[PDB]
Amino acid sequence: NLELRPLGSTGLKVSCVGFGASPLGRVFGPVSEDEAVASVREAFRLGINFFDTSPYYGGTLSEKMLGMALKASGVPRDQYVVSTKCGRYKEGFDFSAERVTRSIDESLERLQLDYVDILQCHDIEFGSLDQIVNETIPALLKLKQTGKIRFIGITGLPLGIFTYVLDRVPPGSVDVVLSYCHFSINDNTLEDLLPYLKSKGVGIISASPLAMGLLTEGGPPEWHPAPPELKSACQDAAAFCQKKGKNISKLAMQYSLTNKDISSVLVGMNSVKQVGENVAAAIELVSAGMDQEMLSEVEAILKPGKNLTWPSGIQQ
Ligand SMILES: NC(=O)c1ccc[n+]([C@@H]2O[C@H](COP(=O)([O-])OP(=O)(O)OC[C@H]3O[C@@H](n4cnc5c(N)ncnc54)[C@H](O)[C@@H]3O)[C@@H](O)[C@H]2O)c1
């Protein structure tokens, strides 16, 4: 019953909830292996057909667990969409043509796949954007000829990296854009970029619907780089939801799915419960709507931290 959305000009249809395999790359051994197979089986059972990973996640382990889980699924390969990344690894950054040419082979080995649907540059704000335009993207175009990848993407936090690159590449070079932390209750600045991206036929994928933990009752992690004004606004709104006996994670996830110009919202999932929670929240949004009274009250509490971002990347 999960809704599928068109992905730009790719001709692909992805589920509005995407499976982010970032948390699959933890620990090691039978435990995390049977949890990876279990969650992906649940994802397929509930209608999820979009899986995103990166060799950075788990130090290439998340790619391994995802590939084993997708292999154990028994689902035809052309009936789900796989996305992996390149350029960012546990040893650092390398967006060179040589690195990204070797990476797709290393990733496909770990994923046990013959191809990935999308290969995306991972956090280009840590590299020279001119290298991305003139070297990395022309390299991935050649990989697209080999059939090992079918669509090209770029990812990162600051929205400006999308306009900079897409202004300077030949039309059609980039097929997909992956942004994060910019379409949630506290930050919806990705809306400004949608008309720009649709004008070029680029698919739009959002991520971090909970602002990487800011919109959870447990709270943000200790390493979270949000300004203290945003973290205070988010924790007060989570307590407000807690006092009223509701879950701010559900409201934040439902909000991120209200704009169908975003083809899919990737959310990290490592448990069957997490998959069913987000899929049911998406289904509940379509069948029962959204709690407008709760959203209006949470949005007012988050006004002090509205659209507040943080520094990301290097300097150019
Ligand atoms: N964060 C980055 O640096 C980055 C950059 C580029 C791409 N991405 C892609 O985007 C995907 C999503 O990123 P995120 O995981 O950081 O999003 P997020 O932090 O907003 O929320 C998801 C996280 O909270 C927990 N959670 C999941 N479902 C929940 C529920 N129903 N109730 C309560 N808690 C729940 C999980 O630990 C998960 O990691 C990643 O998996 C990755 O594939 C991430």
| Whole-angstrom distance, CA of residue 153 vs CA of residue 34 | 30
Q: What is the best residue among 83, 107, 116, 267 to mutate for testing ligand 1's pocket, by most ligand atoms within 8 Å of CB?
A: 267
Residue 246 lies in a domain: no
- Residue 187 token pair: 């930050």
C-alpha span between 4 and 257 (Å, rounded):
12
The partner residues of 86 in beta bridges, in order of sequence, read 121
Instruction: Give the CATH number of the domain where residue 183 resides.
Output: 3.20.20.100
Q: Which residues line ligand 1 (CB under 6 A)?
A: 20, 22-23, 52, 155, 178, 180, 207-213, 216, 249, 266-269, 274, 277-278
**Quick check: is 123 in a domain?**
yes
Measured in whole angstroms, the distance separating CA 191 from the mean position of its chain's CA atoms is 16
Which residue, among 3, 76, 64, has the nearest Cα to 37 in the 3D structure? Answer: 64
- The number of the ligand 1 atom at minimal distance from the alpha carbon of 267 is 12
Which residues are tagged catalytic?
A: 57
As given in the structure block, the two tokens for residue 126 are 């840590």
Contact between 69 and 37 under an 8 Å Cβ cutoff? The reply is yes
With contact defined as beta carbons under 8 Å apart, do 122 and 86 qualify?
Answer: yes
Report yes or no on 230 lying in a domain.
no
Q: Return binding residues for NAD(+).
A: 52, 210, 212, 268, 278
Count how many domains the chain has. Answer: 1
Tell whether 173 is covered by a domain: yes
Most ligand 1 atoms within 8 A of CB, residue of 180, 215, 279 to mutate:
180
Residue type, 126: F
Residue 249 Cα to ligand 1 midpoint, Å, equals 11
* Closest residue by Cα to residue 79 from 107, 56, 49: 49
- With respect to residue 240, please indicate whether it lies within any of the assigned structural domains: no
CB 180 within 8 A of CB 205: no
Torsion of CA 158, 164, 167, 173, to 10 degrees: -70
Q: Which domain holds residue 163?
A: 4-216+254-290
d(Cα 68, Cα 21) in Å, to the nearest integer? 12
Residue 315 falls inside a structural domain: no
Residue 182 in domain: yes
Let me know if 27 is exposed, middle or buried by CB neighbors in 10 A (0-12, 13-18, 19+): exposed
Between CA 299 and CA 308, with CA 302 as vertex, the angle to 5 degrees is 120
Q: Is residue 234 included in any domain, yes or no?
A: no
Two structure tokens written together for 109: 């080995």
Query: Residue 160, Cβ neighbours under 10 Å: how many?
Result: 12
Q: CA-CA distance, 52 to 18, in Å (whole number)?
A: 7
Burial of 96 (0-12, 13-18, 19+ CB in 10 A): middle
Q: DSSP assignment of the chain, as one string?
A: ---EEE-TTS--EEESEEEE-GGGSSS-SHHHHHHHHHHHHHHHHHT--EEE--TTGGGTHHHHHHHHHHHTT---GGGSEEEEEESEETTEE---HHHHHHHHHHHHHHHT-S-EEEEEES-GGGS-HHHIIIIIHHHHHHHHHHTSEEEEEEEESSTHHHHHHHHHSPTTS--EEEE-SSSSSS--THHHHHHHHHHTT-EEEEE-TTTTTTTSSS---TT----HHHHHHHHHHHHHHHHTT--HHHHHHHHHTS-TTS-EEEEE--SHHHHHHHHHHHHHHHHH---HHHHHHHHHHTGGGTT-----S---
Reading the block at residue 209, the tokens are 């619907």
The CA distance from 111 to 98, in Å, is: 20
